[PDB]
Amino acid sequence: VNSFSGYLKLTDNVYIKNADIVEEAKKVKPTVVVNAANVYLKHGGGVAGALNKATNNAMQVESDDYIATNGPLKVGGSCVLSGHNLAKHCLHVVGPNVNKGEDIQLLKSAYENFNQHEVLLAPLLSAGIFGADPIHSLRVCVDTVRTNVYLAVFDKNLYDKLVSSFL
Numbered sequence: 001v002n003s004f005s006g007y008l009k010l011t012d013n014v015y016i017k018n019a020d021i022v023e024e025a026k027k028v029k030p031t032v033v034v035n036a037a038n039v040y041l042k043h044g045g046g047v048a049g050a051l052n053k054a055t056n057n058a059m060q061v062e063s064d065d066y067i068a069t070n071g072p073l074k075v076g077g078s079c080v081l082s083g084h085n086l087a088k089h090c091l092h093v094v095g096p097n098v099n100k101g102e103d104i105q106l107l108k109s110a111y112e113n114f115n116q117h118e119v120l121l122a123p124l125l126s127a128g129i130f131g132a133d134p135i136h137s138l139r140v141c142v143d144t145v146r147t148n149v150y151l152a153v154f155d156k157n158l159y160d161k162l163v164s165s166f167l
């Protein structure tokens with residue numbers, strides 16, 4: 001039993017809700033919140049900008065030190081950093097950016113990172129400015145993640161569309 005509330009069960013292990021991931025994190029304080037990151041951990045907009053803003057830029061400061069030490073992430077890769085005031089940990093996951101020409105097959109690799117964590121609060125990867133088809137991303141999530149994932153989709157119209165189209 002956990003403290004997530006109001007989610008639609010999609011499968012044994014995948015849940016979805018029309019909500020701002022930042023507000024879900026503030027409410028639940030999950031062990032792991034997933035950030036929809038880029039390879040440079042530059043948290044400019046979307047989920048990343050919103051999470052970072054909610055940490056008063058502490059996420060960005062930590063991320064800049066990470067990159068200075070380790071270099072960029074791979075597309076499809078991830079790193080575990082602090083969750084600051086929002087969660088115990090933040091799993092920064094890089095989905096492919098189809099507008100950069102990046103291989104959509106890497107979306108499956110991106111979701112595989114979730115399997116290293118028993119429970120996660122997460123956004124829909126490669127949605128928004130990364131340009132992937134959100135229905136496909138949800139299908140990849142359900143077909144790839146085996147651990148318990150609570151998906152927060154802030155855009156109401158998108159949430160409604162994903163729920164009615166799921167195959």
Ligand SMILES: O[C@H]1CC[C@H]2CCN(c3ncnc4[nH]ccc34)[C@H]21
Pocket residue numbers: 019020021022046047050123124127128129152153154155158
């Ligand atoms: O709405 C979905 C569909 C478009 C994506 C880009 C932003 N986003 C978010 N998802 C969840 N929480 C969020 N907080 C702030 C943004 C945000 C996604």
